[PDB]
C-alpha cells in the first residue's frame, strides 16, 4: 500500500515549514509512517551551490540556477519512489511549483520553459497552497538578507502560482494560512488523512505529463 | 560586426578537439579574432561535478546530470554573447546537440524532454558534424575508462544526432572526417570562412525557438 506524496506550497512567511513539521509529527502520532523532505535540499553538492546563491554569497546565471533547482529535485527521485513504494507518506516543504513560480517571476522567462525540467517528476497526490495576504506575512517578521525576499518580487511569484493552479491535472487545495498555527494545522491534517487513504489507490503519477 | 558562433559535433574519435584547435589557429593566422570554447567546461563548480561523473568517480541521477550539462552551457552565455558582440568568432567543441544525443541514448528519455533545457541558448551560425564510421574511429585508439565510451551506446547517440539533423532551422554541414587531419581541416576552414562572412549579417538567433 503506497504512501502519499504531499506538497506544501505558499506565500512568504505563509507557514510552510512550520506546518510541514507539524503534519509529519501528527501523522506519525496517529500511526502512519510519514517523513519530511524539503526543497531545496541544501545538503548535496548541488544544494550547497543553491544555498550560497540564496544567501547572496554567490551569483549564478538565471537559467543555470533554475536548472540546478530542478536537478536538486531529480537527485532525490530514487529516494522518493523507494519511500512511497514502502508505504511511507512524504510531506514536502516546497517542490517544482516554487521552482516555476520564482524563476517565472523574472523577466523573459516563460512559464512553459520554466516547467520543462521538472516534467516527469513524481506527481504529488495533494498540493496544499497556504494563502495569506503578502501583507499579513509582514506582521510575521521582516524581509531578510536572502534572495527574492522583497515585496515586488514575491508579488510576481504569487501571480505565477495562480497560473499553475489552473492546472486541473493536479489536486490543489487552498488553505487559509491566516489562522492560528494550530487551526491551520488541523485543516491541513484532515486534508492529508483523506489524501493518504483515497489518493493512494492509484499509481504514483508523473508531473506535467 | 559580430563574430560567428561555430560548433563542431561528431562521432567518437571523430576529431572534434583536433579540428577545433586547428580552426582557431588558422582563423587567427588569417587575421580573424577567434577563440576556442568547449563543453563540458570542466573548470566551473558545475563542470567539476560533470568531470567527476564522466570519469566514473561519481554517479549522478540521469535527469540531474542532463540538467547540469545544460546549466554548464547557460553559465557561459553572458561570455558568449559579449564575445560575439565584440566581433570575436567562437569555435565550440561540442554544444547542446551532444547534450541531447547522449542523454537521449538512454532508455526512457524523449528527444523533446532532452531539448528543453537548452531552448533559448545562442544559436550556432554553423554546425559541423564530423562523420566517421563508428569503426574507423576504432582504428583511432581504443575505448577508455570514461563514461559512454562503448560501441552500443555510441550507436544510440549517433541515431539521436541524425534525428537532430532533420531540423532545418539549423545550418548543418556534414564533414567527411575519415580524411587526413590536414584535409579535414581545409574542408572545415573553408566552410568556416563563409559562415563568418555571410552568416553574420543577421542577428544572433535563439536555439530551438
Ligand atoms: Mg520555510
Ligand atoms: Mg513543449
Ligand atoms: Mg575531444
UniProtKB/Swiss-Prot annotation, chains A, B:
UniProt xrefs under Gene3D superfamilies: P-loop containing nucleotide triphosphate hydrolases
InterPro entries: P-loop_NTPase, Thymidylate_kin-like_dom, Thymidylate_kin_CS, Thymidylate_kinase
Cofactor names: Mg(2+)
GO molecular function: ATP binding; dTMP kinase activity; nucleoside diphosphate kinase activity
Enzyme class: transferase
Region of interest: LID: 130-154
Catalytic activity entry: dTMP + ATP = dTDP + ADP
Pathway(s) this gene product operates in, as recorded in its UniProt entry: Pyrimidine metabolism; dTTP biosynthesis
A GO cellular component annotation in the UniProt record: mitochondrion
PROSITE patterns: THYMIDYLATE_KINASE
Annotated binding of ATP, by residue: 13-18, 94, 179, 189
GO annotation terms (biological process): cellular response to growth factor stimulus; dTDP biosynthetic process; dTTP biosynthetic process; dUDP biosynthetic process; thymidine biosynthetic process
Residues modified as N6-acetyllysine: 166
Keywords carried by this UniProt record: Acetylation, ATP-binding, Disease variant, Intellectual disability, Kinase, Neurodegeneration, Nucleotide biosynthesis, Nucleotide-binding, Transferase
Disease in which the protein is involved: Neurodegeneration, childhood-onset, with progressive microcephaly: An autosomal recessive disorder characterized by global developmental delay apparent from infancy. Most severely affected individuals have severe and progressive microcephaly, early-onset seizures, lack of visual tracking, and almost no developmental milestones, resulting in early death. Less severely affected individuals have a small head circumference and severely impaired intellectual development with poor speech and motor delay.
HAMAP family: Thymidylate_kinase (MF_00165)
PANTHER family: THYMIDYLATE KINASE
Subunit field text: Homodimer.
Protein name (Swiss-Prot/TrEMBL): Thymidylate kinase
Lineage: Eukaryota, Metazoa, Chordata, Craniata, Vertebrata
